[model samples]
Structure formats: structure tokens, C-alpha cells
Target: FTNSSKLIRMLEEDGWRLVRVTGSAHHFKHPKKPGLVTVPHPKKDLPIGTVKSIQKSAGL
Candidate 1:
């Protein structure tokens, strides 16, 4: 079951590199292929659309 947390975790270790973090939020910079992505803090976790958006943006 790949929830948003799990999904982002994989991306963290894979290609995306953390650019910065603050107040429960993070900014990531993709090395290549994909582009920069982020989370401006959210409740009830990230939405499924968000997960897929990241996947596509991160070249998953």
C-alpha cells in the first residue's frame, strides 16, 4: 500500500534530492528528467492526485 508518505519516502531515496525543509514541509529538486516539487504542509496526509503528480513529476 503506497500512501503519500511511503510514496514520497521512496522518491526521497531514489532520484529527488531535498533542497530544504521547514515547519513540516519540504522542497525537493530532481537531479534530471523530472522537475522540482514541494509540499506546503497539508492535513489528513497528501491526496492521491498529489501522489501521482509527484510520481509523474519525479519520473516514477
Candidate 2:
């Protein structure tokens, strides 16, 4: 949870616009008017993966 929050803050600080938050997850939209991005928990002991994909899709 902490890592996910940090990641979201880092992205937001870098200018990524936030779209919404669903449950414990956060969805962000690109500042340049691209598609939406979502950040989810790493899952129990699993590592996070979607952050990179979202960043790449948002052209960050």
C-alpha cells in the first residue's frame, strides 16, 4: 500500500493527472489527454507491474 501511494504521488508530482479512485486503487488520466491509467495494489506478496504499463501508455 505504501509503495503504491508513493508511486501515485511520484506520478502526480511529475504532472500526471488523476482521474479517480476505486476502492483502494487510484486511476489517473494523462495530462496530455490520452487514455486512463490505473494503479492497483501489488497483491499480497506479488510485485507491482501495472505502474510501468500505465506510465508508458500515458507517455510519461
Candidate 3:
């Protein structure tokens, strides 16, 4: 339902902090979580499968 950029913004409000950026990829880290979540800065909407995968990684 969302593009990577919008999703990334939403993640930020949920305690995910932006740690670094590589190319178009934005790396995020949650203080209480062990792993990082990487979101790409894309113009178009992301696929459903990919969005779910990212949500999983972000612990949503």
C-alpha cells in the first residue's frame, strides 16, 4: 500500500533510527532490536511480498 520512502518515514515514527545511507538504500536501526532494516528510496510502490518482508525485518 506504500512506497519505500513513505514506509521508511513511518518506520521512523516507530522508534527506528536512521543510521546510514548507501546509494539509494537507507539503513535503520532500532535501539531495542538486534538487526537493522534497510529500505530503498524508491519512487514507485513496492511489491506486497517485499513490503511484508520489510515489515518482518522491522518487527512490525
Top-lDDT candidate index: 3
Residue-level lDDT of model 2, residues 1-60, one tens digit each, is: 236667766678767776687886767776556677777745332244655665576565
TM-score to true structure, per model: 0.64, 0.61, 0.88
- Local error of candidate 2 at 5, Å? 1.6
What value of lDDT does candidate 3 attain over all alpha carbons?
0.86
- Candidates 2 and 3, the one with greater TM-score: 3
Could you tell me the lDDT of residue 59 within candidate 1? 71
**Cα distance off (Å), candidate 2, residue 34:** 1.1
Looking at candidate 2, the ten consecutive residues that score lowest on lDDT are 41-50
Task: Please list the residue runs of candidate 2 whose C-alpha ends up more than 4 Å from where it truly belongs after superposition.
Answer: 41-48
RMSD of each: 2.8, 3.5, 1.1
Count of residue pairs whose backbone atoms collide, per candidate: 0, 0, 0
Global lDDT of each candidate: 0.68, 0.64, 0.86
* Ten contiguous residues minimizing lDDT sum, candidate 1: 39-48
